Structures are given as C-alpha cells and as structure tokens.
Design a protein around this ligand. Structure first.
Ligand SMILES: *[C@@H]1O[C@H](CO[C@@H]2O[C@@H](C)[C@@H](O)[C@@H](O)[C@@H]2O)[C@@H](O[C@@H]2O[C@H](CO)[C@@H](O)[C@H](O)[C@H]2NC(C)=O)[C@H](O)[C@H]1NC(C)=O
Ligand SMILES: *[C@@H]1O[C@H](CO[C@@H]2O[C@@H](C)[C@@H](O)[C@@H](O)[C@@H]2O)[C@@H](O[C@@H]2O[C@H](CO)[C@@H](O)[C@H](O)[C@H]2NC(C)=O)[C@H](O)[C@H]1NC(C)=O
Ligand SMILES: *[C@@H]1O[C@H](CO[C@@H]2O[C@@H](C)[C@@H](O)[C@@H](O)[C@@H]2O)[C@@H](O[C@@H]2O[C@H](CO)[C@@H](O)[C@H](O)[C@H]2NC(C)=O)[C@H](O)[C@H]1NC(C)=O
Ligand SMILES: *[C@@H]1O[C@H](CO)[C@@H](O[C@@H]2O[C@H](CO)[C@@H](O)[C@H](O)[C@H]2NC(C)=O)[C@H](O)[C@H]1NC(C)=O
Ligand SMILES: *[C@@H]1O[C@H](CO)[C@@H](O[C@@H]2O[C@H](CO)[C@@H](O)[C@H](O)[C@H]2NC(C)=O)[C@H](O)[C@H]1NC(C)=O
Ligand SMILES: *[C@@H]1O[C@H](CO)[C@@H](O)[C@H](O)[C@H]1NC(C)=O
Lengths: 484, 111, 120
C-alpha cells in the first residue's frame, strides 16, 4: 500500500495581471483605494509544471502561494501542507471527494510520492471540517497563513498560457488551525495523462484598486513596476437605550455525554476527553439540584460565561463517601498519592454527586478497584495501569504472591446498607488550558432586540456605536458585512 | 522444610513458674519475628496466646509471656492454677511460603 | 464478634471425594487471608495451605500437591476445600482460621471455626 515510481528544466510564463483578491470585508462603491499587502507583482515569471515521466516535487512556501490550473478532467484533487512532513510534527490535508471537501489536521506519516495510498497512520486528529466541494476553464487559488489563520481565496473563469484581463478573487475560507507551514506538495488521482499547473509566490507590495458602483473591483495598478505608475498614485487617479445583536447559537457543546454516561470507570484507570471547537453553556449545569458539590478554584462561578480558553478537559471517577475531600490542591491520604493528584496552581472545577441507586447491589459490585501499594508518589496528571506484584523485601518476587510480595490492587465493596461515607459518589473534574493558540471554546453571547427610527446605541457583532437605524436600498455583495 | 522440636512433657508446683521451650525456628533478619503459641483444652478449638514473639492479644492475663533468643523461642507462665491443664503448640515460618507447627507440650499441675 | 461456621460430618470410601464449606459473618470478608489446618484424632495439628479471598491466589504444602484444591465464592462469602484422593490416613477434623493483618499474610491465626469430622 506504498508504491514508489519516478522515471524522469521547468519553463517560465508571464502572469500579465493576475492574482488580485479582496483585502477585507467592507463595501466601497465608486472609490479609488490604496492598499499595502502581500500581492503578486505585475508581469512576473510564474513556473509551469507538467508533472505527468512522473514527479511531484516538494515546493517552498515563502509567505504565500498563487496556484492556477486549466485541466478540464478532474485529476488534481488536493494539497498537503506541513513543516517536516515525516511523522513528527502536525500536518494538514485538504483532499476532497465528489461531494465533500473534508479537511484534516493530524499527525501524518506520508509516503515517498503520495497519490490517490497516501499516508500510513493518523495519531492525533485535532481538527475536522466538511462542506461543499471546492472544484477549458481556468481555476485559480491563493493560499495565505498569518497569525495561526489559514486563508483560502478562489475563482473560476471560462476561457478558450494565461489569458489577459482582470478578475478578482473572492474570499472562501478562514481556518484557526495554528500549525506552522513552510513546505507544501500537490497530489494527483491515478486510476493517466498530462496535467499542468502554475505556481507563483507573493511579495509585500502596494496596489491601487478601483471599486465600481456595485462594490466590485474592475481595475488596479501596481504602485515599482513603472516610473509612470508611481505618478498615478501621487495624483490618486488613473441616547435612549442600547441594543446588542449577535449571530445565532447553534454549535452547543457536548456536556451530556459525560455527565449522563451509562457506566463510569475505576479510579486507578481514569478517563480523559478532549473538548474543543464548541460553545459551552456553563450556567445550565450550575442551576440544578443533582450535584451536591461544585467546588471551583482559580475562577469565579458566574464569570465562566464571558471567558474563552484554548482547551477544556474532563476526568471521571467513582469513589466512596468521605474521600471526595482528597480531590483538592494540596491533599494526601492514599488516593491523592497513588491514584490521582492535582497540581498546585489548579484552574478548574470539581463536581461530585451521589449514585447509590445505580452502583450498588445486594451481593456487591466488586468491580471498582484502587491502588494500595506503590513505590513513589504520582506526578500531577499521571496514570498507572500496570499490575506488577509489589516487592516489599530483598528477595525477588519472580511473579508470585507470597510472603513479602503483596498484591497492590484492592476492590471496593458496595452494598445498599452502608451509611453515608461508604456509598458510591461519582466525580467529574473540569480543567481549562490556554496557550499560544487562538481561542475556540467560548460562552454564549446574548442579543436584545431591534428598534428602528430612534436614537439608540448599537453593538452589531462588535462594531459599537450610536445613531439611528432605518432600512435602506443598498445591495452588499454576499460576503461583505460592514458598510462604509 | 524445617522441623520444630519441644519436650513431650513438663510440670510445675502451684505458684511456681514453667518455661516450655521451642527450637528450630527460622533464624534470619527478614523473618525473625514470626513465632506464635496456642493452647488447646481437650475436645475444643485452640486459642491464641502470643504472636509476634512478645505481642500479646486482649483477653489473656499478663501471666503468660513469650520470649526469643538466638535460635530458640520460649514461653513463661507464672501463678499456676488448676486451670492450666492443657496442651501447648508452637508455631513458626518454614521458608517456602509455608508455616509449621510443633509436637506439643502437656502442662500438668498436681494437687 | 466474628463467627465462622462449617458444614456437617461426612463418610466416604477411598475412591470418593469430599468438599468442606466455611461461612463467615461479622466482619469484612475480603480483608483477611484464610488458612486451613487438620488434626488427626489424637495427634498434633498439621498445616495445609492458604488462600487470598480478594484475588484467589493459593499455595499448598508440597506433600498435598495434586489432591487438594481451594475455592471461594464472595457473593455469599463462603470458602470451599476439595479433596479427591481419600485413603485410610485421611480421617480427621478440619478447621478454618483467620489472619490478624488485613492485606498481608502471616500465621497469627486468631479466630477459629468449629471442625468438620471426616471419618473415611
Ligand atoms: C437565527 O434564528 C432565527 C430564529 O431562531 C430559530 O429559528 C427557527 C428556524 C428555529 O431553529 C428556532 O429554534 C428559533 O426560533 C431565524 O429566524 C427565523 O428564520 C425562519 C426561516 O425562514 C423564519 O421562518 C422565522 O420566521 C424566523 N424567525 C422569526 C422569529 O421570524 C434566523 O433565520 C436565524 N439566522 C439565520 C442567519 O438563518
Ligand atoms: C443529564 O440528564 C439529566 C436528565 O435528563 C433526562 O434525560 C433523559 C434520560 C430523559 O428522561 C429526559 O426526559 C430528561 O430530561 C438532565 O437533566 C435535565 O436537564 C434539562 C435541561 O433543560 C431539563 O429540562 C430536564 O427536566 C432535566 N431532567 C430531569 C430529570 O431533571 C441533565 O441536564 C443532563 N446533564 C447535562 C450535563 O446536561
Ligand atoms: C507457592 O510459593 C512458592 C514460593 O517459593 C518461593 O518463590 C520465590 C518467592 C522465591 O523466594 C523462591 O526462592 C521460593 O522458593 C512457589 O515456588 C516457586 O514457584 C515458581 C514457579 O515454580 C518459581 O519461583 C520456583 O520454581 C518455585 N520455587 C521453589 C520451588 O523453590 C510455588 O510455585 C507456589 N505454589 C503454587 C501452587 O503456586
Ligand atoms: C467521499 O468522501 C467523503 C469523505 O468521508 C465521504 O462523503 C460522505 O458524505 C456523506 C454526506 O455528508 C456522509 O455520509 C459522510 O460525510 C461521508 N461518508 C462517510 C462514510 O463518512 C464519502 O466516503 C465519499 N463519497 C461521497 C458521496 O461523499
Ligand atoms: C449594478 O447593479 C445593478 C442592480 O443589480 C445592475 O442593474 C441591473 O443589471 C441587469 C443586468 O445588466 C439588468 O438586467 C437589470 O435590469 C438592471 N437593473 C436596473 C434597475 O437597472 C447593474 O447592471 C450593475 N452594474 C454593473 C456594471 O454590473
Ligand atoms: C524568464 O522569463 C522570461 C520568459 O519570457 C525570459 O526572460 C526567460 O525565458 C526566463 N528565464 C530567464 C533566466 O530569464
């Protein structure tokens, strides 16, 4: 399932006026604007590969890339991005199907020259996305990566060598991946035939763009190309209340699959569940009555609906009665030593509730164990699952339970007669993490109303201001949300 | 394994002391303190008198007292009555995850 | 107070077998090793081997190997002993016991059963 094949002076073609995208989401009508961004120069020399002899080299990623193709038959499917591309750092895959555009950010181990059979494993998959597919008619794409955000622009124009004329690329995707990218490679589909694609690199430049009456771009001049063009730039020619509005609340976060699980786990082999890319409603599991303990350290109970974190975890146990007091920062007592220990600078919450009606039996559960003998204390958030016999003497055990060779695993005895302090309490611990990456887990955002023909404040999606709102007749482009 | 030996019989005067012995006990630093003594009356179940050579359990008067030295353990009784008419059994460790008992001593008092 | 209770007498022949039960009440069953002792009618006690009611591991005297087997059942908290090579020199009285230290083995047998008389 891993084939190698390579049986092999690229040409150079002009890019007359190609690769001008929409810098931002603002609707400007009949204006001549000036911009300073990463653009592709005018009359450059783009590289023309026809990798099919067969060879798909790995190319650099200096600041961004402009990629164009003209093959009618669907041969080119997707791209792979990464730093080392060899099973030791995160990598990104955008292979798409006949009706899906699935995107995965995982720890891949790629082949020599992957083709559609590309990778061997996928260890830690930290992202996912599904939507409508991206793909003689020229198709052209622009890829940028800044501040942990991956940005994709694209366009499709029918033609009948790149044409001459002007076409502006509209925004298509913005992802908060967070990985570091410096090399990329394309991948083809083999059941074949010749396939040609064009590659060019972006540079920091300044442009002068022209917005016509309807908000579309129809012309632009590079401000370095000519002594004449430099002159064109200089001449610049060729309270009552407050309403808060916010998008709907859809992507609720899955807290029902942890607090309402059918069967929990032991304490010596506990469970971990990564939670990310969700909207967490922290005030639905506080205003309740089941929980008899909601002890929170590092934050305030009612300030969890205005904060955003990078990551959130969840740990689960079943313990007995008067041991929940040992789950706290700075405790001991044979369950904070050998089973589960909390760091000193904890930032989280601990929630425990009685479950005597589900984990007891007339004879006995005899299913929940705990560690009892160990050589050294546990480091914070460290799990041990082995069952080697604990040697308490000089003579080696040789794996036999005897004189000075204790069995370090004892079972809880549960039955519906013991008093409080011996009945099974289920425990869940929530931990928060924030480091170096864009924050995805966030609380809900409220919305008030819409009053028109009055002098009021407003907070449309974070654009605070004051004035009067009345219906108008202007027509924005679909992706423009600002005005101006 | 090993084999512990103790005299078949002993006797004492009312008010005197007796020193029923034991020998052959495992003599090693790791496993030195493992000796016990039991008493049985005819047609009954035995009773615990001394464990962990000198530790004594509740319910037995301080007259019974154990000791150990070198390779041999020993029992010591005082204030003998007519009640101390029973058979005493030594007990010890015997190496390969196995414990062993002794022959037994009949303690006789005459009136 | 802790109570141990054994079953009744049995009579067998040198081809038969025997099983002895031992019911424990008044304490926590799975926190104490249980030892087995025998006494011939007019001789000294003889040790047999032990059992761990938590795990189930056992160990025997090399003399008895091949003929004796020990088992437990925790739901009703009972321990069973099986012997299956009865001979002329196996008539005896059989006892239970109980260790003092909770999770450790040591022959400080404090509370005893009542004795089953097997007159083969
Ligand atoms: C944002 O949501 C509003 C209404 O919230 C939900 O909409 C329902 C479809 C349902 O999911 C309920 O849980 C909520 O009421 C959307 O406004 C509605 O849109 C439908 C579509 O035609 C319309 O029939 C309803 O009349 C609208 N609601 C009202 C009160 O008039 C709105 O469309 C959502 N935002 C976007 C961008 O779709
Ligand atoms: C864990 O589950 C409880 C129970 O909800 C029930 O779930 C099913 C078994 C079914 O019986 C439903 O009809 C029950 O609702 C959750 O408590 C519920 O919370 C919702 C919140 O809107 C409330 O409307 C219900 O009345 C509650 N149910 C009861 C019995 O009080 C609880 O919220 C779940 N845990 C989490 C974290 O969501
Ligand atoms: C009963 O236990 C004995 C333990 O013997 C000791 O084992 C080690 C702890 C070490 O201290 C040895 O020097 C001791 O003898 C078991 O005997 C050992 O069993 C295993 C497998 O056979 C192995 O270590 C040795 O071969 C044995 N040692 C001997 C024969 O001296 C014995 O197997 C246990 N019986 C049962 C039924 O489990
Ligand atoms: C194409 O590849 C994708 C990648 O999994 C798959 O698309 C399926 O799409 C449907 C509808 O959204 C869903 O069942 C899943 O998203 C996908 N299927 C599975 C099994 O996950 C599918 O394997 C391929 N075929 C199609 C027609 O999409
Ligand atoms: C700017 O937008 C307006 C409105 O969308 C366009 O006017 C329409 O254009 C279409 C096609 O040219 C006609 O079929 C309609 O009859 C026009 N409507 C009106 C009210 O005139 C206009 O063409 C757009 N301008 C450009 C340059 O595309
Ligand atoms: C660069 O591009 C143009 C193509 O028209 C031309 O100057 C030349 O063929 C290319 N290569 C070099 C080295 O100039």
């Amino acid at each position: 399932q891993c084939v190698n094949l390579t049986t092999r002076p690229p040409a150079y073609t002009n890019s007359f006026t190609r690769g001008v995208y929409y810098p931002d989401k603002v609707f400007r009508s009949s204006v001549l604007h000036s911009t300073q961004d990463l653009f592709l120069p005018f009359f450059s020399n783009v590289t023309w590969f026809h990798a099919i002899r067969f060879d798909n080299p790995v190319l650099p990623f200096n600041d961004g890339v402009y990629f164009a193709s003209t093959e009618k038959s669907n041969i080119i499917r997707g791209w792979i991005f990464g730093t080392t591309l060899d099973s030791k750092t995160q990598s990104l895959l955008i292979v798409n199907n006949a009706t899906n555009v699935v995107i995965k950010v995982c720890e891949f181990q790629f082949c020599n020259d992957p083709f559609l059979r590309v990778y061997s494993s996928a260890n830690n998959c930290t992202f996912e996305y599904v939507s409508q597919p991206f793909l003689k008619n020229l198709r052209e794409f622009v890829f940028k990566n800044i501040d942990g955000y991956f940005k994709i622009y694209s366009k499709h124009t029918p033609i009948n060598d790149l044409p001459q004329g002007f076409s502006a690329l509209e925004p298509l995707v913005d992802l908060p991946i967070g990985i570091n990218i410096t090399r990329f490679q394309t991948l083809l589909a083999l059941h074949a035939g010749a396939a040609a694609y064009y590659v060019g690199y972006l540079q920091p430049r300044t442009f002068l763009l022209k917005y016509n009456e309807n908000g579309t771009i129809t012309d632009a001049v590079d401000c370095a190309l000519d002594p004449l063009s430099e002159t064109k730039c200089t001449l610049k020619s060729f309270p009552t209340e407050s309403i808060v509005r916010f998008p709907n609340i859809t992507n609720l976060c899955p807290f029902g699959e942890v607090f309402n699980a059918t069967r929990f786990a032991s304490v010596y082999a506990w469970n971990r569940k990564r939670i990310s890319n969700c909207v967490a409603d922290y005030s639905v599991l506080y205003n309740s009555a089941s929980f008899s303990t909601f002890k929170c350290y590092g934050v305030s109970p009612t300030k969890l609906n205005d904060l955003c974190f990078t990551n959130v975890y969840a740990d689960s146990f079943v313990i007995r009665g008067d041991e929940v007091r040992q789950i706290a920062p700075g405790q001991t007592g044979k369950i904070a030593d050998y089973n589960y220990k909390l760091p000193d600078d904890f930032t989280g919450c601990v929630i425990a509730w009685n479950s005597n009606n589900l984990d007891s039996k007339v004879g006995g559960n005899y299913n929940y164990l705990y560690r009892l003998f160990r050589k050294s204390n546990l480091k914070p958030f460290e799990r041990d699952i082995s069952t080697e016999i604990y040697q308490a003497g000089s003579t080696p055990c040789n794996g036999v339970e005897g004189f000075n060779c204790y069995f370090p695993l004892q079972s809880y005895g549960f039955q519906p007669t013991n008093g409080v302090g011996y009945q099974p309490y289920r425990v869940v611990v929530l931990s928060f993490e924030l480091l170096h990456a864009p924050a995805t887990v966030c609380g809900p955002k409220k919305s008030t109303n819409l009053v028109k023909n009055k002098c009021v404040n407003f907070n449309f999606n974070g654009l605070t201001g004051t004035g009067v709102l009345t219906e108008s007749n202007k027509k924005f482009l679909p992706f423009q949300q600002f005005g101006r | 394994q090993s084999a512990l030996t103790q005299p078949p019989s002993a006797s004492g005067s009312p008010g005197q002391s007796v020193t029923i012995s034991c020998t052959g006990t495992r003599s090693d630093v790791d496993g030195y303190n493992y000796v016990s003594w039991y008493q049985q009356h005819p047609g009954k179940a035995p009773k615990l008198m001394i464990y962990e050579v000198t530790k004594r359990p509740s319910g037995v008067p301080d007259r019974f007292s154990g000791s150990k030295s070198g390779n041999t353990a020993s029992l010591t009784v005082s204030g003998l009555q007519a009640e101390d008419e029973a058979d005493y059994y030594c007990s010890s460790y015997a190496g390969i995850n196995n414990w062993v008992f002794g022959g037994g001593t009949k303690l006789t008092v005459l009136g | 107070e802790v109570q141990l209770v054994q079953s009744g007498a049995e009579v067998k022949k040198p081809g038969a077998s025997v099983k002895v039960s031992c019911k424990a009440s008044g304490y926590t069953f799975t926190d104490h090793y249980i030892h087995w002792v025998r006494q011939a009618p007019g001789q000294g006690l003889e040790w047999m081997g032990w059992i761990n009611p938590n795990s189930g591991g056992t160990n025997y005297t090399q003399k008895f190997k091949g003929r004796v087997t020990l088992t437990r059942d925790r739901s009703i908290s009972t321990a069973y002993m099986d012997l299956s090579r009865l001979r002329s020199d196996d008539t005896a009285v059989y006892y239970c016991a109980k260790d003092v230290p909770p999770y450790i083995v040591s022959g400080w047998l404090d509370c005893w059963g009542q004795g089953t008389l097997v007159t083969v």
